[PDB]
Amino acid sequence: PRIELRSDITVELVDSSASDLAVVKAARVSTAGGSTRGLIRYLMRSRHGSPFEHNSMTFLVRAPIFTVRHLMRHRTWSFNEESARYREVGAAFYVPDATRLLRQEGKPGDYRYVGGSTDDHQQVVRSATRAYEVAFEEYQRLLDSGIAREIARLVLPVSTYSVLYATCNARALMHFLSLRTHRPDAAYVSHPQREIEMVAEQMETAWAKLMPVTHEAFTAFGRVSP
Amino acid sequence: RIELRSDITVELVDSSASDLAVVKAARVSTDGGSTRGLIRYLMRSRHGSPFEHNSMTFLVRAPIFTVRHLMRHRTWSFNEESARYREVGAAFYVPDATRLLRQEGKPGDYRYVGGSTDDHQQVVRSATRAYEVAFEEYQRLLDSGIAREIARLVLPVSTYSVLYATCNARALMHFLSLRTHRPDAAYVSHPQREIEMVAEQMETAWAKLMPVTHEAFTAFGRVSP
Amino acid sequence: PRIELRSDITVELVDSSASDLAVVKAARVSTSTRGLIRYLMRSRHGSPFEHNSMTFLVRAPIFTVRHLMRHRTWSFNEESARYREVGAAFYVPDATRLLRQEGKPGDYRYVGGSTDDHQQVVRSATRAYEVAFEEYQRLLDSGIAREIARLVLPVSTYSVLYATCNARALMHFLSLRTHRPDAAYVSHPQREIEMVAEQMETAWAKLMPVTHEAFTAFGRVSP
Amino acid sequence: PRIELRSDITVELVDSSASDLAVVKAARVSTYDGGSTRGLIRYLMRSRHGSPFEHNSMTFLVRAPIFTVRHLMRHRTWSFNEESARYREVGAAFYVPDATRLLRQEGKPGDYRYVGGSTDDHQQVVRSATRAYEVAFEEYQRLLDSGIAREIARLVLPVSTYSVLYATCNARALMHFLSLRTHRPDAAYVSHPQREIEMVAEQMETAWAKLMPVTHEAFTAFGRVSP
Numbered sequence A: 001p002r003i004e005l006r007s008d009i010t011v012e013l014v015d016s017s018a019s020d021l022a023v024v025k026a027a028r029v030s031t032a033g034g035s036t037r038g039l040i041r042y043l044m045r046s047r048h049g050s051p052f053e054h055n056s057m058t059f060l061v062r063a064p065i066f067t068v069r070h071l072m073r074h075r076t077w078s079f080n081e082e083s084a085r086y087r088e089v090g091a092a093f094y095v096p097d098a099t100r101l102l103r104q105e106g107k108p109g110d111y112r113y114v115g116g117s118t119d120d121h122q123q124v125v126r127s128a129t130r131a132y133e134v135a136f137e138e139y140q141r142l143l144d145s146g147i148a149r150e151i152a153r154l155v156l157p158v159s160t161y162s163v164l165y166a167t168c169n170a171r172a173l174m175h176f177l178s179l180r181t182h183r184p185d186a187a188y189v190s191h192p193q194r195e196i197e198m199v200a201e202q203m204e205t206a207w208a209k210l211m212p213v214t215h216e217a218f219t220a221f222g223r224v225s226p
Numbered sequence B: 001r002i003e004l005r006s007d008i009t010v011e012l013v014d015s016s017a018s019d020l021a022v023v024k025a026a027r028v029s030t031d032g033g034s035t036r037g038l039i040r041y042l043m044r045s046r047h048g049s050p051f052e053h054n055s056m057t058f059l060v061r062a063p064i065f066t067v068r069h070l071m072r073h074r075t076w077s078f079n080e081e082s083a084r085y086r087e088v089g090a091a092f093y094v095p096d097a098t099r100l101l102r103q104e105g106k107p108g109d110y111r112y113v114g115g116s117t118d119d120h121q122q123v124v125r126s127a128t129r130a131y132e133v134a135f136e137e138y139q140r141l142l143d144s145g146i147a148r149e150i151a152r153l154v155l156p157v158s159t160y161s162v163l164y165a166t167c168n169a170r171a172l173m174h175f176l177s178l179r180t181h182r183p184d185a186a187y188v189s190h191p192q193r194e195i196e197m198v199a200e201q202m203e204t205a206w207a208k209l210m211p212v213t214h215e216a217f218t219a220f221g222r223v224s225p
Numbered sequence C: 001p002r003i004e005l006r007s008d009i010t011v012e013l014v015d016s017s018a019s020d021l022a023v024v025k026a027a028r029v030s031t032s033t034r035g036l037i038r039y040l041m042r043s044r045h046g047s048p049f050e051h052n053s054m055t056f057l058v059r060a061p062i063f064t065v066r067h068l069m070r071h072r073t074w075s076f077n078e079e080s081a082r083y084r085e086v087g088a089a090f091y092v093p094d095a096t097r098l099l100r101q102e103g104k105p106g107d108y109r110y111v112g113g114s115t116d117d118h119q120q121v122v123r124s125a126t127r128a129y130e131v132a133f134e135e136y137q138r139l140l141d142s143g144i145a146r147e148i149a150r151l152v153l154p155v156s157t158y159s160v161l162y163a164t165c166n167a168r169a170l171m172h173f174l175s176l177r178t179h180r181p182d183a184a185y186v187s188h189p190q191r192e193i194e195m196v197a198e199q200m201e202t203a204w205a206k207l208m209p210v211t212h213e214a215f216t217a218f219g220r221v222s223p
Numbered sequence D: 001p002r003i004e005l006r007s008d009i010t011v012e013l014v015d016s017s018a019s020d021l022a023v024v025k026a027a028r029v030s031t032y033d034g035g036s037t038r039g040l041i042r043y044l045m046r047s048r049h050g051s052p053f054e055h056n057s058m059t060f061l062v063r064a065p066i067f068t069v070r071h072l073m074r075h076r077t078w079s080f081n082e083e084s085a086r087y088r089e090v091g092a093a094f095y096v097p098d099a100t101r102l103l104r105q106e107g108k109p110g111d112y113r114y115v116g117g118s119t120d121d122h123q124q125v126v127r128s129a130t131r132a133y134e135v136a137f138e139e140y141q142r143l144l145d146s147g148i149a150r151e152i153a154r155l156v157l158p159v160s161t162y163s164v165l166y167a168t169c170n171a172r173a174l175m176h177f178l179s180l181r182t183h184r185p186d187a188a189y190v191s192h193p194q195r196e197i198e199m200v201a202e203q204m205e206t207a208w209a210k211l212m213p214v215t216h217e218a219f220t221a222f223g224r225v226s227p
C-alpha cells in the first residue's frame, strides 16, 4: 500500500452560533428582554436576506484540492487551509467510488453526466493509482534530496486531499447551496461537480439541525438565497 | 415632548468567539507552542484569516450621523430599525459637557480642543430649538396623514437609531484601528468622538471574550492582521 | 431666501470601462455576443459580468444616500460635513410624489396626496429646514466645530458622492432598488432611491445594451 | 502527445480605466509644497484613506500553474474568471522552476527562508517533475480516450499544470495584494510569499506603475501598506 486511495469527502460542524431565533431577533432589532415561520418566510418572499447574516457556522472540511478550489470561490466565506509550503503532504488521494457517474453527454456547457460501466470504474482506479503512485514517489524523492516543500509539491495531483476550516453565516450558506447542489426542481438548476455537491449536502444536513425553520423555507422558496 | 440624551449604547447580544477559536482555525485542528505565542505570530505576520472564524453581535443605539460611520465598514453585517416602517421616537443626541467643541488647524487634521461653559450651553440651546421645531413638524405631518417615509425628511441627523451589528474579530480589529484615536498606534486615525464611543465599548466587550488577541492587537500597534 | 429647496436627484456617469465585449472576453478568457450573455444569465454565471467598471456622480439627500450606501459590493466616496461647511440645499418631494400610505407598513403601499397635502409638506419642510440651517450657521459663527454643528441638519440635506460598481453589482442593485412589474421579484424601494437607480440603468443601457436587455429578459435578477 | 515544460509566468494588462486623476476626483467630490495631485495622494496614503483608490479598474490576463493561481484567488476583493477543466481538455503545459529559483529551505517552516540549490538540485527537480508529469498526462489522455468525463480525468493532473484566467482589481485591492505577495525587506511588513506568485505580483505592479505613477510612488514611500 504505497499511497492511500479514498472516496470520502468529510464535513464536520466545529462550532456555531446559529438558530432561527437569531434571525428573528436581528430582523426585529430585538432588545434585551407559527410567528417564527411567518417572519422567516416573509423575509424570503421579500428577499430581505440581511437578517440571515447575524450568525455563524464553522465547518472542518476534508476534500481533494480540485473540490476545495470550488469551495474557495465563495468570497463571502472565511477559510483557513493546511499549507503544503509549511508541512509535508500525506499520501492520501481521492478517487470516485463505484456509484459516481463517469461519462458525459451533451454540450460541455450542460455539465450532463451518465453512468460508466464496471470497466470504466476499473480503468479510473488503475490510471489514478499509477499516476498518484508515481507523483508521491517523486514528491518524497525530492523531499529526501533536500528540495523545499513548496517546490516538491509541484508533482502532486489535484486529487490530493487537503483540510480546512470554512466559516459562513446562513445567508452565505444558502447562496453556496443554491449554486453547489443540483436540484431539478429549484428556481435555478445548477450543475456543480459531484464532489463539491457532497460537501454542500453535508453542510446542509448540519445546518438543518441548527436552523430547521430557515432550512425548510429555503427549499420551499426554490433554494435561492434571500 | 422631545428627549435629549448624550449616551451611545453598545450591548453584546450574542457571540461565538475565544482565543482558542483562532488557535483551532490556524492549526486547522482535527508548533509545540502556546496560545499567546501563536496569536502574536499571526498578528505580527498579518496572517489575519484565522481571526475570522468567530462572531460577535452588538446591539447599538446611536444618532444617525454616527450610525453612518459604523455602516461604512462593508465587512460587517447590519440590520437597523426603519423610519419608513415605524414612526420615529423623539430622542436626539447632544454632546455632554466633557465633549471637545472647537477645532484648530487644517480641516483634514481633525484636531479638536476644549470649549467653554458658554460653548456647551450654546450647543444645547441651538440643538434644543432646532430639534423641537423638527419634531413638531414631523408630528404635524404624520397627523395630517403624510406617509412616514416622507415625514421623517424634517428629522435631524442627531435622531437616535438602533441596529444589530455583527462582525468577526478581524473585521472588529480593522474597525478599531480606524475608529479609535490612539496617539501611540502605528496609524493615528481621527474618527469623530461619537463613533469612537461605540468602538470603545465594542473593544471592552471583545477583550472579555478574546483577551490574548485583544492584548496582541494593541502590542503590535493596533493594526488589523 | 436663506435656504434652497429642490426636488431633483441627479446621477451623471463620470467615467467607465464597460461593454458587452468585456463580458464575452472575460467569459471566454480571451487572449454571438447575445447568445453567450443570455447563457451566462440563465446559468447564473455572473462572474464574467464583474470585469468592468462604471463611476457615477450622485447628488441626493442623506436619507437616500443611506439606501445607496447599504450596497456593500460598490465603492463610494462622499463629501464630509466634518470636513467642510454644508450648503443650504434640502430636498422636498415634487407634486408627482405619492404622499400618503394605506395598508400594512410592510406592504409599502403609497397613494396620491391632494394639492393641500403637498403644500403642507412644503410649509412644514421650509419651517423645519429654515430653523435647522439658522442654528447650524449660528453655531458655526460661534466657533463650534463643523462635526458638532451639523447635528441640527435634517436627513433631507443634499450630499454628493462618487459611486463605482461593476455590471454585476449594478444589476443586483437595480433588482432591489426599482419597482417593476416585469421583474421576478416586486421590490418596494423608496421612490428617491428608485430615481437614482433609474438614471443609472439608463446610462448603463448605452454602454452594455446586450446585457441590459438580457437582465430584463431574465426577470431583473442579477446573475 | 508530448508534454511541454515551461518556467514562465505571464501577466498582460487586458484593459483598464485607472489613473491618478481618478483618485483625486473621487477624493475631492464636492458641491501643498508641490503638485496638488502628489500632495493629495500622499496625504490619503499616509492617513489610510483608501476608499478613493477604489474608483478605477484594471483587468489582467494571467497564465500560471494551479498552485500559484490558488494564491492569487485567495484575494476576495478581486474578480476572477478562469478556464475550466470540467469544460475543456487541459493542455500539456506544466511548470518547473528555472535555474535561478532558490530550491532549498533553511530554518523554521514559518521563517519561509529559501536558499540556493546546486546544479544537481535543479537537475533532480527537472528529472522528477518530468517523470511525474509524463505519467500524469499519459494517464489523463488514456482516461479521455476511454470516454471518461473530463472533470474526472483531470484528477490525475498535477498542481503545476498551467491555467489561464482574467483577474480584475481596483488600485486599493492591487495595493493590498502587492503588500502581501511581494517580499520587500525594506517594507513596513515583510511578507514571505512563494516566488511564483511574487512573479505575478511584480508584473502587475510594473503595469500599474505606468497607469498610476504618483500612487505607485506614494505606496512605496509609505512602506508598501494599502491605504
Ligand SMILES: Cc1cc2nc3c(=O)[nH]c(=O)nc-3n(C[C@H](O)[C@H](O)[C@H](O)COP(=O)(O)OP(=O)(O)OC[C@H]3O[C@@H](n4cnc5c(N)ncnc54)[C@H](O)[C@@H]3O)c2cc1C
Binding pocket: A048, A049, A050, A053, A076, A169, A171, A172, A175, A225, A226, B075, B076, B077, B078, B079, B080, B081, B082, B085, C070, C071, C072, C073, C074, C172, C176, C177, C187, C188, C189, C190
Ligand atoms: C424594500 C427594502 C427594505 C429594506 N428594509 C431594511 C430595514 O428595515 N433595515 C435595514 O437595515 N435594511 C433594510 N434594507 C436594506 C437591505 O437589508 C440591504 O442592506 C440592501 O438592500 C443591500 O442588499 P444586499 O445586502 O443583498 O446587497 P449587498 O450588500 O450589495 O450584497 C450583495 C450580495 O452579496 C452577498 N453578501 C455580501 N456581504 C455578505 C455577507 N457579509 N454575508 C453574506 N452574504 C453577503 C449576498 O448574496 C448579497 O445579496 C431594505 C432594503 C430594501 C430594498
Ligand SMILES: Cc1cc2nc3c(=O)[nH]c(=O)nc-3n(C[C@H](O)[C@H](O)[C@H](O)COP(=O)(O)OP(=O)(O)OC[C@H]3O[C@@H](n4cnc5c(N)ncnc54)[C@H](O)[C@@H]3O)c2cc1C
Binding pocket: B072, B073, B074, B075, B076, B174, B178, B179, B189, B190, B191, C073, C074, C075, C076, C077, C078, C079, C080, C083, D049, D050, D051, D052, D054, D077, D170, D172, D173, D176, D226, D227
Ligand atoms: C478619519 C476618517 C475620515 C474619512 N473621510 C471620509 C470622507 O471624506 N468621505 C467618505 O465617503 N468616507 C470617509 N471615511 C470613511 C472611509 O473612506 C471608509 O469608508 C471607512 O473608514 C471604512 O474603511 P474601509 O473601507 O477600509 O473598511 P471596510 O469596508 O470594512 O473594508 C475593509 C478592508 O477590506 C478591503 N476592501 C473592502 N472592499 C473593497 C473594495 N471594493 N475594493 C478594494 N478593497 C476593499 C480594503 O482592504 C478595506 O480596507 C473616513 C473615515 C475616517 C475613519
Ligand SMILES: Cc1cc2nc3c(=O)[nH]c(=O)nc-3n(C[C@H](O)[C@H](O)[C@H](O)COP(=O)(O)OP(=O)(O)OC[C@H]3O[C@@H](n4cnc5c(N)ncnc54)[C@H](O)[C@@H]3O)c2cc1C
Binding pocket: A076, A077, A078, A079, A080, A081, A082, A083, A086, B047, B048, B049, B052, B075, B168, B170, B171, B174, B224, B225, D074, D075, D076, D077, D078, D176, D180, D181, D191, D192, D193, D194
Ligand atoms: C506568506 C503567506 C502565508 C499564508 N498562509 C496560509 C495558510 O497557511 N492557510 C491559508 O488558508 N491561507 C494562507 N495564506 C493566505 C492568507 O490567509 C489570505 O487568504 C491571503 O493572503 C489574502 O489576504 P486577505 O484575506 O487579507 O485579502 P482579501 O481576501 O483580499 O481581503 C482584504 C481585506 O479585506 C478584509 N476582509 C475581507 N473579507 C473579510 C471577512 N470575511 N472578514 C473580515 N475581514 C475581511 C480584511 O481586512 C482583508 O485583509 C497565506 C498568505 C501569505 C501571503
Ligand SMILES: Cc1cc2nc3c(=O)[nH]c(=O)nc-3n(C[C@H](O)[C@H](O)[C@H](O)COP(=O)(O)OP(=O)(O)OC[C@H]3O[C@@H](n4cnc5c(N)ncnc54)[C@H](O)[C@@H]3O)c2cc1C
Binding pocket: A073, A074, A075, A076, A077, A175, A179, A180, A190, A191, A192, A193, C045, C046, C047, C050, C073, C166, C168, C169, C172, C222, C223, D077, D078, D079, D080, D081, D082, D083, D084, D087
Ligand atoms: C456550475 C458552475 C460553473 C462554473 N464555471 C466557472 C468557470 O468556467 N470559470 C470560473 O472561474 N468560475 C466558474 N465557476 C465559479 C463561479 O463563477 C463563481 O466563482 C462561484 O460560483 C461563486 O459564486 P458567487 O461569485 O456568486 O459567490 P460569492 O463570491 O460568494 O459572492 C456572492 C454574491 O456576492 C456578490 N458579489 C461578491 N463579490 C462581488 C463583486 N466583486 N462584484 C459584484 N458582486 C459581488 C454577487 O451578488 C455574488 O453572487 C462556476 C461555478 C459553478 C457552480
Ligand SMILES: O=c1[nH]c(=O)n([C@@H]2O[C@H](COP(=O)(O)O)[C@@H](O)[C@H]2O)cc1Br
Binding pocket: A081, A082, A083, A084, A085, A086, D067, D070, D071, D072, D074, D192, D193, D194
Ligand atoms: O503563501 C501562501 N499563500 C496562500 O495563498 N496560501 C493558501 O493556503 C492554502 C495552501 O496553500 P499552499 O500553497 O499549499 O501552502 C491555499 O488555499 C493557498 O491559497 C498558503 C500560503 Br503558506
Ligand SMILES: O=c1[nH]c(=O)n([C@@H]2O[C@H](COP(=O)(O)O)[C@@H](O)[C@H]2O)cc1Br
Binding pocket: B080, B081, B082, B083, B084, B085, C063, C066, C067, C068, C070, C188, C189, C190
Ligand atoms: O427601503 C429601505 N432601504 C434601506 O436601505 N433601508 C436601510 O435601513 C436603515 C433605515 O432606513 P429608513 O430609510 O430609515 O427606513 C438604513 O440603514 C437604510 O439604509 C431601509 C429601507 Br425600509
Ligand SMILES: O=c1[nH]c(=O)n([C@@H]2O[C@H](COP(=O)(O)O)[C@@H](O)[C@H]2O)cc1Br
Binding pocket: B065, B068, B069, B070, B072, B190, B191, B192, C078, C079, C080, C081, C082, C083
Ligand atoms: O470620519 C468620517 N467617517 C466617515 O464614515 N465618513 C463617511 O463619509 C460620509 C460623510 O460623513 P460626515 O460625518 O458628514 O463627514 C459619510 O458616508 C460617512 O459615513 C466621513 C468621515 Br470625515
Ligand SMILES: O=c1[nH]c(=O)n([C@@H]2O[C@H](COP(=O)(O)O)[C@@H](O)[C@H]2O)cc1Br
Binding pocket: A066, A069, A070, A071, A073, A191, A192, A193, D082, D083, D084, D085, D086, D087
Ligand atoms: O463547476 C465549477 N466550479 C468552479 O468553482 N469553477 C472554478 O473555475 C476554475 C476551474 O475549475 P475546474 O474545476 O478546473 O473547472 C476554478 O477556479 C474553479 O474554482 C469552475 C467550474 Br466549471
